[PDB]
Amino acid sequence: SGAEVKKPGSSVKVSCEASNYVITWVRQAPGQGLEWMGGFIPDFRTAMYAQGFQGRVTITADESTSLAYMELTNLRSEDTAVYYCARGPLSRGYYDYWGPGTLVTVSASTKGPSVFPLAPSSKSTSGGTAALGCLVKDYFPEPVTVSWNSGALTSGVHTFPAVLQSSGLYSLSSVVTVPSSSLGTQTYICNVNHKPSNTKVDKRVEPKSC
């Protein structure tokens, strides 16, 4: 929680802890009052939807994790607000618990990255060490996160601090050093995430073909 930035047309998902109670999602524009978005009744597994949101409010649950979720889709600037989960007892019309707020700001400047391979050199030291990576370019705002092989590859990984380019967009690289001898048999995939743009990209990095 705290604060998330989102791109227009993206979506934000607000989770809540899920007998005889209702979960409700409520938002509050900055300096404004409270507006109901919908709710979920865990004992009956039914949802309620506010008409003002068209069909943009998706309500789902997970019995196993006892979490329920409200996703607001097709975000616009006017959806900028603090989003809350609340709970109260069924058919009483009050909410005795309110979760922590998340500020969601919908900003047109938001841009998802392009991901390019930093391919291992074909002149790498035989039985020595090779370097490879992913270049994550032209995103806004921070942050992006990068893992390798879902996070299974951590040894020798360096993910650099982002730099602000003259364009006003961020760039960064993540690299890893591996055995040269591994290049012909081992797979290396960078997992890039930029939550503001709902960007989730896997890029396989291979020696450049000749």
């Binding site: 009052g33 409270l34 109901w36 019309g93 009050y94 909410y95």
Partner: protein
């Protein structure tokens, strides 16, 4: 498909009763709940079903609903009650909230109440005298305390301490302590602290005569 309206603003001084109204067509037909919200915090339920108080909500909070108007009443309003308040109604269909009322608890001038304390007999036995002047529950902070002994202005033998703004009434308090040897204390009669503060029309003196009732 109906709207609730609350005044945007209510202001009171500490200890005064704050009244916050929630209005909408035929509101008394339904059940109203009240939420308190502090800056950057989540709302907290203070009343439900018109007038029931959740566990841990102080008794100074109470409410009523009739006709087109529901009311949140805060008796003996405290500084800590400064917050936004929202009414919420339930007609069985849609959850609707009032627009909110900002409750401001105003802290304006308050002259100090002044008290002077001679040293205890117990302390005097040890060879030292502490004389204490208390300025209680004043606002604003700026205050001057001067000590006089047999009308002679004292300098260098007193120290002051001040409290942080009080959580209930946002006032300050201040103690000034004059320290003398037992020998000096016994050499003089009249002990006085003179207080100057914005709330007083002229400086106020509290005094005592050593060895009196």
């Amino acid at each position: 498909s109906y709207v609730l309206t609350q005044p945007p603003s209510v202001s009171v001084a500490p200890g005064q009763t704050a009244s916050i109204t929630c209005s909408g067509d035929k509101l008394g037909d339904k059940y109203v709940s009240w939420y308190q919200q502090r800056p950057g915090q989540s709302p907290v339920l203070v009343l439900y079903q018109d007038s029931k108080r959740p566990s841990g909500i102080p008794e100074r909070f109470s409410g009523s609903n009739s006709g087109n108007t529901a009311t949140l009443t805060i008796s003996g309003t405290q500084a800590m009650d400064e917050a936004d308040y929202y009414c919420q109604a339930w007609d069985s269909s849609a959850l609707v909230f009032g627009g909110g009322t900002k409750l401001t608890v105003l802290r304006t001038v308050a002259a100090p109440s002044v008290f002077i304390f001679p040293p205890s007999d117990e302390q005097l036995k040890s060879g030292t005298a502490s004389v204490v002047c208390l300025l209680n529950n004043f606002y604003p902070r700026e205050a001057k305390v001067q000590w006089k002994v047999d009308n002679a202005l004292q300098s260098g033998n007193s120290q002051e301490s001040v409290t942080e703004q009080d959580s209930k009434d946002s006032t300050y308090s201040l103690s000034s302590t004059l320290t003398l040897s037992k020998a000096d204390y016994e050499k003089h009669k009249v002990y006085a602290c003179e207080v100057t503060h914005q709330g007083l029309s002229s400086p106020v003196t509290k005094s005592f005569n050593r060895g009196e009732c």
